Design a protein around this ligand. Structure first.
Ligand SMILES: CCCCCCCCCCCCCC(=O)O
Ligand SMILES: CCCCCCCCCCCCCC(=O)O
Ligand SMILES: CCCCCCCCCCCCCC(=O)O
Ligand SMILES: CCCCCCCCCCCCCC(=O)O
Ligand SMILES: CCCCCCCCCCCCCC(=O)O
Ligand SMILES: CCCCCCCCCCCCCC(=O)O
Ligand SMILES: CCCCCCCCCCCCCC(=O)O
Ligand SMILES: CCCCCCCCCCCCCC(=O)O
Length: 582
């Protein structure tokens, strides 16, 4: 209407409004105390209500941008705390807003946010639920000022439900700790996934992005016509482009518009949207993004007629190459919800390479007659990797699977740090356990998505402290080529072994009184260092050692003296091992 603020307040509801205002202020004023933000929230909410009562009331017809920037510029310590950010206030909109946006600090220097003990958390949750949760929301938003505010709200509500259920359980910790871990990991991945999509857009351009959206939306909405998918791809590309620039309101409005269009057109798109489309504005976009794949229509024909048989392939291609490739991609993807999106794009690139060569060659239709054959080994490559790795997972369990991976990747890239090798290997093993309990139909997209996050963490860490030319290569490739680049890593025959360090392999009784988790990580750290010291060590030779180390740890955590069993048996274990592996 006349009043954007009034209109937001009506659409979100007072509770969501207050939480979004808190996140937004926290994201821009990363260094003000919680109590300051509480007071800004209350003033803004007060003013909002006046508008709701009367859109003609004073100031109620200013833009949300103008109101927000005005409010920021009234912060008394703005120059003293934020330095050059206060210079934004000398500008008029929209420059002022742009200026504010650029001064968000993606790397604030704040202490890590520690998880308190369970009884401490549950007690504060009971004694003042609202401030417990809102102060958490503030601590998180100010540490991640680009994280999309409504998704951050969706996480906050899941935490609230976590505390609600677990703080009244018999074993509070056993209930609560798994949920907090799950949520922390989902959140960190979700944020790493937003960042990664924006970086890929930048580096690879808008056409690769559109290719990716085609494949993905085509899998999702297999009954939509190409021109409907193409339309969503164009809109989605705009949404993601604007959301990467970072203005909350511009991103939210784009996301709302698309959700609305989709909901007004369910019968052209998918039959699984009814639920999402009935949800309030706040949750619509999010629910649609997560909607399960529609059913494939059923009597769909071979792509042969259109894409290989037809006289006109080269004509139809030449007339609009991306549209033709896009149609190829659409028809492929909609028939294959069981493929990774990156597999579909390799196949599209193969087809494109083939048309480019064949359509300019002596006999086009002869030249590309056999193109679909090129696809077979690109499909089977990941399928067979999934079966080889998942069989290994079933034989070993998760922990021993992680150990095999640790041995595996240490030999390939022994220049990687141990903590990186250990974190990534543990994490890849978690992808094992997650995705290998899916049936075939769902295995490839599972791995793609979870691998995408682990192999991005790997790349993130590594480009921060570079050490392997091979890893930097795989990290700087197209996202299409990232994972196969990693699967092609070969043992580093060039590697000079690490020199023996007695400390590295000295163990104390404190390890008997460590978490299951933390003991594992110390055993896995030693395993890596064992491989880094004896890289040519054999599978039988490694297992001999592990079996002895295992015996050792039971023995020395089972005695009346602990301290010296660990020093005494230790010296013995290490001696035995150093001559077993020659
Ligand atoms: C989202 C806003 C509410 C979150 C409640 C935070 C609980 C504390 C978790 C600390 C982070 C962690 O280590 O898991
Ligand atoms: C109608 C939307 C445009 C779709 C363009 C199709 C391009 C398909 C083949 C090339 C694959 C690009 C993958 C990449 O380089 O990241
Ligand atoms: C005395 C109260 C003055 C009212 C403050 C303005 C309320 C609107 C807040 C808009 C927050 C959105 C931030 C953004 O995306 O840039
Ligand atoms: C003043 C408060 C306005 C904050 C802007 C966020 C609006 C959230 C609407 C969600 C749109 C969406 O993601 O689909
Ligand atoms: C699977 C596509 C269905 C379309 C649903 C529209 C929502 C996508 C918006 C994406 C960009 C927003 C920023 C983010 O939260 O990552
Ligand atoms: C260990 C994790 C389970 C097996 C993963 C094998 C790779 C799957 C490849 C899927 C995505 C892609 O096509 O690159
Ligand atoms: C640095 C650690 C090496 C990373 C290995 C990533 C491989 C992902 C897919 C599984 C495979 O083919 O080995
Ligand atoms: C280089 C010779 C010193 C060898 C010392 C033994 C190192 C043992 C670490 C093995 C990790 C145990 C695997 C496990 O059971 O979790």
């Amino acid at each position: 209407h006349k009043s954007e603020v009034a209109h937001r307040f009506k659409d979100l509801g007072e509770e969501n409004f207050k939480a979004l205002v808190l996140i937004a202020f926290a994201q821009y004023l990363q260094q003000c105390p919680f109590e300051d933000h509480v007071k800004l929230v209350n003033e803004v909410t007060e003013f909002a209500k006046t508008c709701v009562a009367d859109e003609s009331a004073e100031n109620c017809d200013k833009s949300l941008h103008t109101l927000f920037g005005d409010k920021l510029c009234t912060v008394a310590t703005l120059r003293e705390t934020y330095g050059e950010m206060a210079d934004c206030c000398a500008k008029q909109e929209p420059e002022r807003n742009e200026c504010f946006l650029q001064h968000k600090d993606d790397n604030p220097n704040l202490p890590r946010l520690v998880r308190p003990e369970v009884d401490v958390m549950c007690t504060a949750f009971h004694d003042n639920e609202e401030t417990f949760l809102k102060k958490y929301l503030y601590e998180i938003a100010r540490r991640h000022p680009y994280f999309y505010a409504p998704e951050l709200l969706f996480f906050a509500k899941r935490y609230k439900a976590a505390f609600t259920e677990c703080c009244q359980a018999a074993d509070k910790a056993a209930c609560l700790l798994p949920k907090l871990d799950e949520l922390r990991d989902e959140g960190k991945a979700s944020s790493a996934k937003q960042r990664l999509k924006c970086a890929s857009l930048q580096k690879f351009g808008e056409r690769a992005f559109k290719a990716w959206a085609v494949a993905r939306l085509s899998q999702r909405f297999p009954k939509a016509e190409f021109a409907e998918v193409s339309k969503l791809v164009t809109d989605l590309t705009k949404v993601h482009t604007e959301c990467c620039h970072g203005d909350l309101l511009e991103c939210a409005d784009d996301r709302a518009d698309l959700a609305k269009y989709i909901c007004e057109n369910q019968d052209s798109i998918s039959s699984k949207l009814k639920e999402c489309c009935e949800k309030p504005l706040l949750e619509k976009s999010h629910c649609i993004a997560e909607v399960e794949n529609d059913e494939m229509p059923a009597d769909l024909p071979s792509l042969a007629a259109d894409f290989v048989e037809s006289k006109d392939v080269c004509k139809n291609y030449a007339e609009a190459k991306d549209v033709f490739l896009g149609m190829f991609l659409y028809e492929y993807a909609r028939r294959h919800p069981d493929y990774s999106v990156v597999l579909l794009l390799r196949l599209a690139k193969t087809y494109e390479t083939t048309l480019e060569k064949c359509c300019a060659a002596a006999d086009p239709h002869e030249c590309y007659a056999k193109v679909f054959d090129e696809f077979k080994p690109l499909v089977e490559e990941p399928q067979n990797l999934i079966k080889q790795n998942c069989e290994l997972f079933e034989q070993l369990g998760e922990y021993k699977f992680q150990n095999a991976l640790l041995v595996r990747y240490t030999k390939k890239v022994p220049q990687v740090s141990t903590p990186t090798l250990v974190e990534v290997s543990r994490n890849l093993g978690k992808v094992g356990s997650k995705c290998c309990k899916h049936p075939e139909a769902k295995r490839m997209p599972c791995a793609e998505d979870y691998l995408s996050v682990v192999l991005n963490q790997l790349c993130v860490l590594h480009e921060k402290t570079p050490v392997s030319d091979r890893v930097t290569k795989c990290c700087t490739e197209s996202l299409v080529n990232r994972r196969p680049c990693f699967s092609a890593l070969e043992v580093d025959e060039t590697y000079v072994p690490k020199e023996f360090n007695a400390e590295t392999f000295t163990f104390h009784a404190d390890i008997c009184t460590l978490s299951e988790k933390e003991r594992q990580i110390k055993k896995q750290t030693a395993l890596v260092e064992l491989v880094k010291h004896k890289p040519k060590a054999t599978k039988e030779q490694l297992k001999a050692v592990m079996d002895d180390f295992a015996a050792f740890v039971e023995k020395c955590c089972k005695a009346d003296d602990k301290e010296t069993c660990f020093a005494e048996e230790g010296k013995k274990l290490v001696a035995a091992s150093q001559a077993a592996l020659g």
